[PDB]
Tab-separated table of C-alpha atoms and ligand atoms in Angstrom:
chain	number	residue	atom	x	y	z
A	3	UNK	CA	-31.910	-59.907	19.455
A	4	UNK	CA	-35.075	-59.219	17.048
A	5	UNK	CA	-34.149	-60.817	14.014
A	6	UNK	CA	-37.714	-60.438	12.069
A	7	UNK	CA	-35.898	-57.994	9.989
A	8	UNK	CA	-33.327	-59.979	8.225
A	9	UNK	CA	-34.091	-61.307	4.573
A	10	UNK	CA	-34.166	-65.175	3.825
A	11	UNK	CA	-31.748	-64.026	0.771
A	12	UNK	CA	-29.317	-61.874	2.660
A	13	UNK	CA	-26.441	-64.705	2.391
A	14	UNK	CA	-22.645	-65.088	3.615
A	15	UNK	CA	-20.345	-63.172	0.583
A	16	UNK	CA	-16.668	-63.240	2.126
A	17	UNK	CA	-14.916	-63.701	4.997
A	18	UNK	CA	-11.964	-62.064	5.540
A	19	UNK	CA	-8.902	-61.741	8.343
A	20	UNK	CA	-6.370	-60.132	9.890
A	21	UNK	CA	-4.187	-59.152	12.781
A	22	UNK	CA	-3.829	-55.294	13.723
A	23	UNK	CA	-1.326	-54.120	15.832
A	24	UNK	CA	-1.031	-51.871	18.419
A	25	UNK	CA	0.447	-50.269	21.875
A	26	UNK	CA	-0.831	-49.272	25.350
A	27	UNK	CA	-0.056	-46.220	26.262
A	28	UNK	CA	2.245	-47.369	29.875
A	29	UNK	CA	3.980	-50.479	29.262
A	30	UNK	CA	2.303	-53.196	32.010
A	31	UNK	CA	4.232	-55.266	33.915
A	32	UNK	CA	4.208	-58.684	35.564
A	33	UNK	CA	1.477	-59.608	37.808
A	34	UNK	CA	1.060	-62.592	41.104
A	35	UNK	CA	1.864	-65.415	38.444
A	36	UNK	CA	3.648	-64.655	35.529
A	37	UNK	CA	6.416	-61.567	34.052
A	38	UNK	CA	6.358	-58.429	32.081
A	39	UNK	CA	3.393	-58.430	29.747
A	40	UNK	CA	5.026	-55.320	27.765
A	41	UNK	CA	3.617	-52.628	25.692
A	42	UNK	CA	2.438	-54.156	22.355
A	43	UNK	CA	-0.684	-55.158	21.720
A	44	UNK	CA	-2.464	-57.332	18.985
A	45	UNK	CA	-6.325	-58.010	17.600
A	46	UNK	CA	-7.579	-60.891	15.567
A	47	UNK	CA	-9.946	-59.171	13.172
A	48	UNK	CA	-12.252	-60.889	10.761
A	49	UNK	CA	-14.292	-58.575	8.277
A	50	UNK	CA	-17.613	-60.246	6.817
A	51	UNK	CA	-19.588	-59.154	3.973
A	52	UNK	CA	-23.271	-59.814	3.840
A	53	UNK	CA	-25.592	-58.651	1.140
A	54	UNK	CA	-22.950	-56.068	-0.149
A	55	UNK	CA	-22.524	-54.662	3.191
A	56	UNK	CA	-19.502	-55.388	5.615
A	57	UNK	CA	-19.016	-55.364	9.622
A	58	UNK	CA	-16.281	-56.126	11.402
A	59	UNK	CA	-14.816	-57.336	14.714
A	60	UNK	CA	-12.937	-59.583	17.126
A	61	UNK	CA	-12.691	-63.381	15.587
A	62	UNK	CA	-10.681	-66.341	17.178
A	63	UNK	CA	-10.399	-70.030	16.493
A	64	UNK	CA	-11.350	-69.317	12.612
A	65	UNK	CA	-9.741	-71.104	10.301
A	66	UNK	CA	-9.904	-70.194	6.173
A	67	UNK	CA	-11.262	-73.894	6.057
A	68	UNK	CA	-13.610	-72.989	8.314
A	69	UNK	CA	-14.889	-69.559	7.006
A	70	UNK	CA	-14.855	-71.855	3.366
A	71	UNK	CA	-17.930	-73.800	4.639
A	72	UNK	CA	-19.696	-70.830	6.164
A	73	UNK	CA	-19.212	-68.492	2.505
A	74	UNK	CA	-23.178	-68.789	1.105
A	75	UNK	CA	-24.935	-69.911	3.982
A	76	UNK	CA	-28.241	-67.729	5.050
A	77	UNK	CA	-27.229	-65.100	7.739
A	78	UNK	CA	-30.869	-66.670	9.313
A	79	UNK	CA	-29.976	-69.598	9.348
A	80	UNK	CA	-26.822	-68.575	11.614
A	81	UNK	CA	-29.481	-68.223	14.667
A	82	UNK	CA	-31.379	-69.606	17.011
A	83	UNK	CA	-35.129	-70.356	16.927
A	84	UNK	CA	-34.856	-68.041	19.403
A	85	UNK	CA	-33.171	-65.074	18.001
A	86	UNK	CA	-29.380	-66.221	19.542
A	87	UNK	CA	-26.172	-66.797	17.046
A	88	UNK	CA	-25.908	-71.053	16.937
A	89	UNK	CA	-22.846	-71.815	19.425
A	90	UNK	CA	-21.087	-73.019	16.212
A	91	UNK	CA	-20.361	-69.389	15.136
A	92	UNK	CA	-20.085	-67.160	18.479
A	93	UNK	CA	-16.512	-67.610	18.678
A	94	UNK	CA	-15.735	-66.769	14.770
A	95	UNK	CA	-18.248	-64.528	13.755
A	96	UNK	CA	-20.347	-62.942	16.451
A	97	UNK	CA	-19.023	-59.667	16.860
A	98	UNK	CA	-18.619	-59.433	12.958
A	99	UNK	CA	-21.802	-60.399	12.545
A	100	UNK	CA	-23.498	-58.021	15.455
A	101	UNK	CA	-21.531	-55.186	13.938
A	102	UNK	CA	-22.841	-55.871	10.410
A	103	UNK	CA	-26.385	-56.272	11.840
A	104	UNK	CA	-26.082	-52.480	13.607
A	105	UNK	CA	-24.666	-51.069	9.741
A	106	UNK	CA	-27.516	-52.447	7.918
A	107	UNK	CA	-30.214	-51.245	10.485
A	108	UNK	CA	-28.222	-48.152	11.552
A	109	UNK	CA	-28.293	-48.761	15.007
A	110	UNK	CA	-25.573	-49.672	17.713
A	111	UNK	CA	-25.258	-52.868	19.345
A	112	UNK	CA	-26.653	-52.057	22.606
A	113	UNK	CA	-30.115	-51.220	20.919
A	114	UNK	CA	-29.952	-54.645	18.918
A	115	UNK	CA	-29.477	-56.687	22.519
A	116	UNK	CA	-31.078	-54.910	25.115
A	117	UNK	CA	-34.289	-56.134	24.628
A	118	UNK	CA	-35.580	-52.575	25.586
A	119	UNK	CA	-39.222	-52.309	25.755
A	120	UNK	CA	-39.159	-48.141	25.954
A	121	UNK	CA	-38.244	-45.661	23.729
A	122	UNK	CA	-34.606	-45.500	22.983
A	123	UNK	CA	-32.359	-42.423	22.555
A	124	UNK	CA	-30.793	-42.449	26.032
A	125	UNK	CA	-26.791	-41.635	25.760
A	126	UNK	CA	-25.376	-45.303	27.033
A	127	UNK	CA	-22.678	-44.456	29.907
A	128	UNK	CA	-20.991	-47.343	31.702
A	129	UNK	CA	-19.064	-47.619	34.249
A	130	UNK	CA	-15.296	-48.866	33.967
A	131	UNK	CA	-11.905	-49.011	36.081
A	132	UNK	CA	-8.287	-48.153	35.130
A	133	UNK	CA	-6.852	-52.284	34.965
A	134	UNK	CA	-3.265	-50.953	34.434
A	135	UNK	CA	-1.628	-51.331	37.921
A	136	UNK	CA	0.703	-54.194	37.599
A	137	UNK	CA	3.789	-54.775	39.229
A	138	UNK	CA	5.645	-51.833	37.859
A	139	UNK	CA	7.913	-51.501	40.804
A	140	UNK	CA	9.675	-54.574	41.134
A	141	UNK	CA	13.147	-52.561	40.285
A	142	UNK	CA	12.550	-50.495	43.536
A	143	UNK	CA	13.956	-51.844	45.903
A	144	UNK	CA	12.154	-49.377	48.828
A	145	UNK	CA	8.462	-49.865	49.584
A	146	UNK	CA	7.584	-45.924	49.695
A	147	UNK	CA	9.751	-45.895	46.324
A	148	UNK	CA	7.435	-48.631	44.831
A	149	UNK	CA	4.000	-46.635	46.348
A	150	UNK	CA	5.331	-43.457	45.151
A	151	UNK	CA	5.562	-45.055	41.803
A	152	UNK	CA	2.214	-47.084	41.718
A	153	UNK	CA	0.670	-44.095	43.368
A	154	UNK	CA	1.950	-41.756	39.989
A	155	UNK	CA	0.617	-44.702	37.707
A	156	UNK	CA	-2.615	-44.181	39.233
A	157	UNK	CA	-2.431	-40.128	39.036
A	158	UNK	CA	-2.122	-41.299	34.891
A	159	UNK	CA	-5.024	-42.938	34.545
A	160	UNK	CA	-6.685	-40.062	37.010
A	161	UNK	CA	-5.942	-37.507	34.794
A	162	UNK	CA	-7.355	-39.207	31.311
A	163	UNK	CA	-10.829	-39.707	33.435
A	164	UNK	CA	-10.350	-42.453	35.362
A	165	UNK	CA	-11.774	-42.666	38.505
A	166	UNK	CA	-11.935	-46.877	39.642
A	167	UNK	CA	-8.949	-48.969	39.695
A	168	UNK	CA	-7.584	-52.429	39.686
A	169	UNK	CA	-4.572	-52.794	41.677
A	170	UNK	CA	-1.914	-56.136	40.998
A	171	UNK	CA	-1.199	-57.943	44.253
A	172	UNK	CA	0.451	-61.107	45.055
A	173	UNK	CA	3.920	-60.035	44.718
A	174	UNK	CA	5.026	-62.379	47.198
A	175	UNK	CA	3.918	-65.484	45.425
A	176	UNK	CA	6.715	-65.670	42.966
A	177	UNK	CA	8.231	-62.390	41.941
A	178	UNK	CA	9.339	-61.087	45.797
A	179	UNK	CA	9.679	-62.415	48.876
A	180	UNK	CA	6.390	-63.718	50.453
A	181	UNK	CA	6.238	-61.402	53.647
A	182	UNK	CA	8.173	-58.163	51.755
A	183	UNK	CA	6.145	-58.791	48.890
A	184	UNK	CA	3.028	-58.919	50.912
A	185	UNK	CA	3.612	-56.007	53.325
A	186	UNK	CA	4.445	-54.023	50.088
A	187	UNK	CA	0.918	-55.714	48.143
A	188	UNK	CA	-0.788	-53.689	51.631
A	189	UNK	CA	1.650	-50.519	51.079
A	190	UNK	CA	0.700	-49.907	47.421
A	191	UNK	CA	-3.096	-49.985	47.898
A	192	UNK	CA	-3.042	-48.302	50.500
A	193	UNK	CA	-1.408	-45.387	48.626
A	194	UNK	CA	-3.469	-45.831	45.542
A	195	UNK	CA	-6.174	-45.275	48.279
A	196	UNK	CA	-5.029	-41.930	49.040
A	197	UNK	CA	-4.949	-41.160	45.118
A	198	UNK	CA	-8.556	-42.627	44.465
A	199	UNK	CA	-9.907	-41.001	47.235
A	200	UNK	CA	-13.464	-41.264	48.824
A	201	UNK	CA	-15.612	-41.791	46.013
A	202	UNK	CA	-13.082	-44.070	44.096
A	203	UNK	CA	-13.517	-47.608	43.636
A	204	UNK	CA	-10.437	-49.893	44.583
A	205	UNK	CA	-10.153	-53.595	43.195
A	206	UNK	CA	-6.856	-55.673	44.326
A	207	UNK	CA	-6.607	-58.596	41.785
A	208	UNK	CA	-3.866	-61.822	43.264
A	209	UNK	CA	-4.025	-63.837	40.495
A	210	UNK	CA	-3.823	-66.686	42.875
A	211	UNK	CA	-1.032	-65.631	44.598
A	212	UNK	CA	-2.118	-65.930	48.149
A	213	UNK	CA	-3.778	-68.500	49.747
A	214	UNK	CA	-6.551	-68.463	52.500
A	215	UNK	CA	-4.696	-66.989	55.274
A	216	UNK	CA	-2.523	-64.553	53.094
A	217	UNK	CA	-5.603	-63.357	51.941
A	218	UNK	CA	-7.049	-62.573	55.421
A	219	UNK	CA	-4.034	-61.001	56.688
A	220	UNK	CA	-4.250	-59.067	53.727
A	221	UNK	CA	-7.568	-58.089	54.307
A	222	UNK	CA	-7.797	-57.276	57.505
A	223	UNK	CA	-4.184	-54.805	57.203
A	224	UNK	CA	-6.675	-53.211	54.463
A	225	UNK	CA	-9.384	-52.863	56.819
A	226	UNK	CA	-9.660	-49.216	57.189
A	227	UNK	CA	-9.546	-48.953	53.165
A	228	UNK	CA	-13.002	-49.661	51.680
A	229	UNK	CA	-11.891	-52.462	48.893
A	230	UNK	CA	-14.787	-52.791	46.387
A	231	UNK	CA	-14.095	-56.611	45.516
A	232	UNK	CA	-10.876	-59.222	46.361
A	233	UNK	CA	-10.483	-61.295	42.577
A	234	UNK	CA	-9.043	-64.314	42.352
A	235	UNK	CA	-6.964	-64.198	45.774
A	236	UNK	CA	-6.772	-68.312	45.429
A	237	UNK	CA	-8.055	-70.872	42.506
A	238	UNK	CA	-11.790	-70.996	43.463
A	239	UNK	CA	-12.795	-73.832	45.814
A	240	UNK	CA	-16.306	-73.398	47.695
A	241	UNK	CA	-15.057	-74.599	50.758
A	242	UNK	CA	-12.167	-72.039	51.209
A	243	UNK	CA	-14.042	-68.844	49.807
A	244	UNK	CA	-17.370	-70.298	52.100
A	245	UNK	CA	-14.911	-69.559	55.234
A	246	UNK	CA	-13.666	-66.142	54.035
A	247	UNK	CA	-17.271	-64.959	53.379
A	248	UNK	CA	-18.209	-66.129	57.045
A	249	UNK	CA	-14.557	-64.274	58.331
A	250	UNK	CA	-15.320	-61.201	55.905
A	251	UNK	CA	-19.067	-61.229	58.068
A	252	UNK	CA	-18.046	-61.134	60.791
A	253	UNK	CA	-15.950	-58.327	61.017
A	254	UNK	CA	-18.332	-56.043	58.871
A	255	UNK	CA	-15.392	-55.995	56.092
A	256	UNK	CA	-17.962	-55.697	53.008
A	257	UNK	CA	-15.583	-56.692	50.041
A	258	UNK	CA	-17.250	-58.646	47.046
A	259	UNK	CA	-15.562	-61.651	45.591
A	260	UNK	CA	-15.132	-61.963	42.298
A	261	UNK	CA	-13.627	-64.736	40.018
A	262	UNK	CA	-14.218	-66.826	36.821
A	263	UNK	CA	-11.369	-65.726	34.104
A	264	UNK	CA	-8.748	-68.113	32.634
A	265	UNK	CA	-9.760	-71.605	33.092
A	266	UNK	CA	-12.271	-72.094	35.504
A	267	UNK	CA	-13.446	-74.140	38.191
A	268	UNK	CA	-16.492	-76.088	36.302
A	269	UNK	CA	-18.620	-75.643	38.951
A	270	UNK	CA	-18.163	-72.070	39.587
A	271	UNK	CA	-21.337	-70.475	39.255
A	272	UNK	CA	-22.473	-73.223	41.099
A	273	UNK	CA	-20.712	-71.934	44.177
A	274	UNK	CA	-21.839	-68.067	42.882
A	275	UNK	CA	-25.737	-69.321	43.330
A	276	UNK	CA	-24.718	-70.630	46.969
A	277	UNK	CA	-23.395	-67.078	48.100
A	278	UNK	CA	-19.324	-68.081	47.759
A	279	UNK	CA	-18.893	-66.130	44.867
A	280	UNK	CA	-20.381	-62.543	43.939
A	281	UNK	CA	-18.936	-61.219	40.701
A	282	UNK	CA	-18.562	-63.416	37.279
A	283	UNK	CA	-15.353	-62.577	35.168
A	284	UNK	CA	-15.588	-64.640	32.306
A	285	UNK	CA	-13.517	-63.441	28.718
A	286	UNK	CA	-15.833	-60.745	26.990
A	287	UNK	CA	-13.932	-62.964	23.736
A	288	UNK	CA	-13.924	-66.225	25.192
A	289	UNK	CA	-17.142	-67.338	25.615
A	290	UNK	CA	-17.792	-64.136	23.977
A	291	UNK	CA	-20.901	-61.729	23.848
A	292	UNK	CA	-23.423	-63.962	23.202
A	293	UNK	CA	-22.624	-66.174	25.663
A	294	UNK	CA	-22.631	-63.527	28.364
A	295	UNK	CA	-26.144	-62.407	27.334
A	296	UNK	CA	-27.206	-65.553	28.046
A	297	UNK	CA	-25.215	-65.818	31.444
A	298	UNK	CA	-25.415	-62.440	32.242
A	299	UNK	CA	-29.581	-63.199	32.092
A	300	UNK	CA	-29.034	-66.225	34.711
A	301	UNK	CA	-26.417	-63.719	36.981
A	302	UNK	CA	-29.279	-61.369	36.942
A	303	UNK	CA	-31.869	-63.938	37.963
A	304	UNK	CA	-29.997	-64.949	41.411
A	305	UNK	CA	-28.680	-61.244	41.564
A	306	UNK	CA	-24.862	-62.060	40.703
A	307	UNK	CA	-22.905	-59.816	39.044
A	308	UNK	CA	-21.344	-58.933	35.846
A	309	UNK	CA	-17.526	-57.964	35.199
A	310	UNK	CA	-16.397	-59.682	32.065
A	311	UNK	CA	-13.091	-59.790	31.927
A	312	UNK	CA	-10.733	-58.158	29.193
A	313	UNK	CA	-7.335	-57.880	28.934
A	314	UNK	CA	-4.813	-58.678	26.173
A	315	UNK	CA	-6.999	-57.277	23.506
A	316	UNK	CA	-8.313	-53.708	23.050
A	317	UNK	CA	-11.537	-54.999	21.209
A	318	UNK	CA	-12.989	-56.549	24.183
A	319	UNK	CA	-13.710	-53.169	26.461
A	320	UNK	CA	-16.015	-51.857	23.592
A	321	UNK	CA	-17.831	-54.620	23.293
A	322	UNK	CA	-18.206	-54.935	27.136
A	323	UNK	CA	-19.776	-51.525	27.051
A	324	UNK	CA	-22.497	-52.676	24.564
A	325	UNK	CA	-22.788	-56.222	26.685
A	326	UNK	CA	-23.966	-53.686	29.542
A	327	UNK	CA	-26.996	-52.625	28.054
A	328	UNK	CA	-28.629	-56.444	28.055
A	329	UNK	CA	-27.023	-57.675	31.635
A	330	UNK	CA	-28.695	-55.918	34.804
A	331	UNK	CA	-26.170	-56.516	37.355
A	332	UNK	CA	-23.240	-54.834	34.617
A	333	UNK	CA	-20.235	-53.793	37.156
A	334	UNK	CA	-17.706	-52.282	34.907
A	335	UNK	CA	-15.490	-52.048	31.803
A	336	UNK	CA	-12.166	-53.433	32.358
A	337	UNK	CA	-10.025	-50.266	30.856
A	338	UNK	CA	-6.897	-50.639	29.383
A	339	UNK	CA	-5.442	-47.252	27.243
A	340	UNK	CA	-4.523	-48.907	23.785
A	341	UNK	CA	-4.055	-47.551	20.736
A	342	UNK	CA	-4.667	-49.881	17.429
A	343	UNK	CA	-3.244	-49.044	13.921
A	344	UNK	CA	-6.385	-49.209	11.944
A	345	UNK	CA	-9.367	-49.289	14.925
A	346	UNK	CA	-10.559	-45.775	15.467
A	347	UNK	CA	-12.000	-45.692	18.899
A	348	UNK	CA	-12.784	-41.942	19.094
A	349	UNK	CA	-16.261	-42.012	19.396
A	350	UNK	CA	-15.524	-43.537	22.384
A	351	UNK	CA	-14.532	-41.145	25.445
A	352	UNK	CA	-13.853	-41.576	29.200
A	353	UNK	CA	-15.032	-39.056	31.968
A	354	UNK	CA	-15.377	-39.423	35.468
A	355	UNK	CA	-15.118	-43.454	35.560
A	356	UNK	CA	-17.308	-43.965	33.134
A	357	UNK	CA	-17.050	-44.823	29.307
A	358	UNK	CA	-19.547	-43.238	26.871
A	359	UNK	CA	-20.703	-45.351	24.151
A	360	UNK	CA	-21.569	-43.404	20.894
A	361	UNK	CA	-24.285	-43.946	19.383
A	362	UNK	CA	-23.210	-44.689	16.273
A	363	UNK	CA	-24.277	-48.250	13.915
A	364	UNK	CA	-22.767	-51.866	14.861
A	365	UNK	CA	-19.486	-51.256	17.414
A	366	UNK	CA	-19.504	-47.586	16.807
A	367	UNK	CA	-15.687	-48.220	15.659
A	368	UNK	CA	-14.860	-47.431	12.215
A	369	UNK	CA	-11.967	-49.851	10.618
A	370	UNK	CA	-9.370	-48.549	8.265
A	371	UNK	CA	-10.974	-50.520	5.137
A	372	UNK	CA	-7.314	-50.536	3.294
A	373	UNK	CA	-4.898	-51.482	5.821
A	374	UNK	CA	-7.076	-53.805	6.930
A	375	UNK	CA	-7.565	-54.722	3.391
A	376	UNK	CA	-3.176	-54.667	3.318
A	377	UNK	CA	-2.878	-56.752	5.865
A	378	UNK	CA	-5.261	-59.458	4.989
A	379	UNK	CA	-3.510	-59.954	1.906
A	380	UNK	CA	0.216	-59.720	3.547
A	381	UNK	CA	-0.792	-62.284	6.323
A	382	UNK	CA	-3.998	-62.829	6.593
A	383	UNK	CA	-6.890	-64.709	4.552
A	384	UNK	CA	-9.635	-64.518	2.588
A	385	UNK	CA	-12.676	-66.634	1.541
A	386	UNK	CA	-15.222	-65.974	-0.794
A	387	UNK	CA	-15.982	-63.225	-3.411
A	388	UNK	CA	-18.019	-60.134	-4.526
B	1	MG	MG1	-7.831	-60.950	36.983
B	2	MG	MG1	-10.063	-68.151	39.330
């Protein structure tokens, strides 16, 4: 971030937030380890104003107390010697903050954190996958009635441009039988396969479901289907993914392994630098964007990859399409079809597996300035004046 353009006097007015609301368009439902996650959907929104200007975006663990202590400090003196938002802010403020910083320059995030050395003007693309396949078939009792079913979810997300997908397995860890649930995990991608078809990227995502040897059975039934990564088949332990990356050698099964959401294994990237590990998945919220600049830069530097997480808030996926433009080894925005009351998103469009990013200043997402300002004052907060 170049921040050699921001006055000394440009100061903290008001902080202000709220919670839109929201629905996906297919209700989701459970996945390997817990039930239905449902159809309504929520964002914490905080809306700062800095030198008579606002921006807007994603804000967690903010308290008014908080934001009280922040109102009339120097938006410099928010950052780094080294042009980074302090750690004591990311959380709160960041995205806010970036957005606010791409309305008073007029440009969009991803030209404020690239670090670009050549001209821009380039239309930012990015790639992303449909994350929507949970286990929407556990009232079927019949495993071609559950693929036919999965398969048609997948046809949805097909038809509104999506061309990569992330397919729930682990059904036999808790919500199914082990083996019926696990022949019918192999049944459904398989099918969603056929759907995707030769050029279409297939995840399968366990969420620690399976264990070592679930995971190899598994793997090799799926052998003839080119999987694009296996996430979080088991909690991450070196030792245990070490052995699958020797098994996954040698039998030629190329399949990356990815991991890192929720709360991780401490020394996970550790294990990533050593070869046990290929793609990251920390929270695009939590750490947040400027953390993953920062991580995404070390990723790059022993040429692991990118896939921050996002699910559970709609924010998230366009901010991971800005993250892409500073992080080398990007994979993908996680997709999920939301729609927010109050968070236009139409600049946005997806086509072919791939999201395009407008152009536009901050987040290129313009907020509905008096619901948000409704529901501030209904149940939110506000700190601060004009
Ligand atoms: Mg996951
Ligand atoms: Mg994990």
């Amino acid at each position: 971030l170049n921040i050699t353009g921001i006055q000394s006097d440009w100061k903290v007015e008001k902080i202000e937030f709220a919670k839109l609301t929201g629905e996906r368009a297919r209700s989701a439902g459970a996945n390997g380890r817990i039930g239905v996650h449902g159809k309504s959907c929520t964002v914490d929104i905080a809306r700062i104003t800095i030198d008579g200007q606002t921006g807007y975006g994603s804000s967690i663990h903010m308290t008014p107390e908080w934001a009280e202590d922040v109102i009339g400090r120097r938006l410099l003196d928010l950052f780094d010697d080294r042009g980074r938002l302090r750690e004591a802010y990311r959380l709160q403020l960041e995205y806010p903050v970036l957005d606010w910083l791409g309305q008073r320059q007029g440009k969009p995030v991803y030209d404020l954190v690239s670090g670009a050395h050549l001209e821009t003007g380039a239309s930012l693309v990015v790639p992303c996958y449909d994350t929507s396949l949970y286990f929407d078939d556990l009232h079927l009792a019949d495993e071609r009635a559950a693929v036919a079913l999965m398969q048609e979810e997948a046809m949805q997300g097909y038809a509104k441009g999506q061309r990569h997908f992330k397919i729930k397995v682990g059904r036999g860890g808790r919500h199914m039988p082990l083996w019926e649930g696990t022949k019918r995990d192999i049944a459904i991608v398989r099918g969603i396969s056929e759907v995707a078809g030769p050029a279409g990227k297939i995840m399968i995502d366990a969420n620690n479901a399976y264990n070592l040897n679930l995971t190899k059975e598994v793997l090799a039934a799926l052998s003839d289907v080119n999987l694009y990564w296996l996430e979080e088949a088991f909690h991450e332990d070196e030792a245990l993914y070490e052995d699958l990356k020797e098994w996954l050698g040698q039998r030629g099964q190329n399949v990356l392994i990815a991991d890192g959401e929720g709360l991780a294994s401490p020394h996970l990237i550790e294990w990533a630098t050593r070869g046990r590990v290929d793609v990251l998945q920390y929270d695009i919220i939590w750490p947040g964007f400027t953390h993953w600049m920062e991580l995404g830069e070390k990723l790059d530097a022993h040429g692991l990859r990118s896939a921050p997480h996002c699910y559970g808030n709609a924010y998230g996926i366009y901010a991971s399409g800005h993250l892409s433009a500073a992080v080398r080894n990007f994979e993908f925005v996680e997709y999920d079809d939301i729609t927010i009351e109050g968070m236009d998103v139409s600049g946005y469009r997806i086509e072919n597996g791939e999201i395009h990013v407008p152009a536009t200043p901050g987040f290129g997402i313009v907020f509905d300035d008096e619901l948000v300002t409704y529901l501030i004052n209904r149940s939110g907060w506000s700190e601060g004046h004009h």
